[PDB]
Amino acid sequence: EDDLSVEAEIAHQIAESFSKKYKFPSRSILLYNFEQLKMNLDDIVKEAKNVPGVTRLARDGSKLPLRCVLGWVALANSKKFQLLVESNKLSKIMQDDLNRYT
């Protein structure tokens, strides 16, 4: 019941911004979207639930930190993204987005 609501909330927000280009720091700006993952939406949603604080935001119906969620899912799943991204800078950006949204 709770789970269903959390997942629909996350799915709704990711679907709404599926092709929006977010900015990530590169090793050498990396632009990326959810579409580029080439992941099914349910797999993206499952993965997004492990971003600390995201499940709780989704349960409250709050605005998600989507650039952060995308960076995390891409870091965990996309070999290309992992190669291109500056991972330390990414972690700081992800943490700050999370501080701002929670």
Where are the domains positioned within the chain? 1-102
DSSP 8-state secondary structure symbol assigned to residue 85: B
Helix (H, G, I), strand (E, B), or coil: what is residue 79?
A: helix
CB neighbours of residue 37 within 10 Å: 20
Instruction: Choose among 95, 57, 90, 64: nearest CA to 75.
Output: 90
H-assigned helices in the chain = 2-16, 41-48, 54-59, 66-77, 79-84, 87-101
CA–CA distance, 8 with 29 (Å, rounded to integer): 31
Helix (H, G, I), strand (E, B), or coil: what is residue 17?
A: coil
Where is the chain broken, named by the residue before each break, C–N > 2.5 Å?
28
Q: Which fold has domain 1-102?
A: Four Helix Bundle (Hemerythrin (Met), subunit A) (1.20.120)
DSSP 8-state secondary structure symbol assigned to residue 40: -
What resolution, expressed in A, was reported for this entry? 2.2
**What are residue 24's DSSP bridge partners?**
30
Q: With beta carbons less than 8 A apart as the criterion, state whether 13 and 64 touch.
A: yes
Work out the end-to-end distance of the chain between its first and last CA atoms, rounded to an integer number of angstroms. Answer: 23
Q: Which two tokens stand for residue 11?
A: 């799915």
Method: X-ray
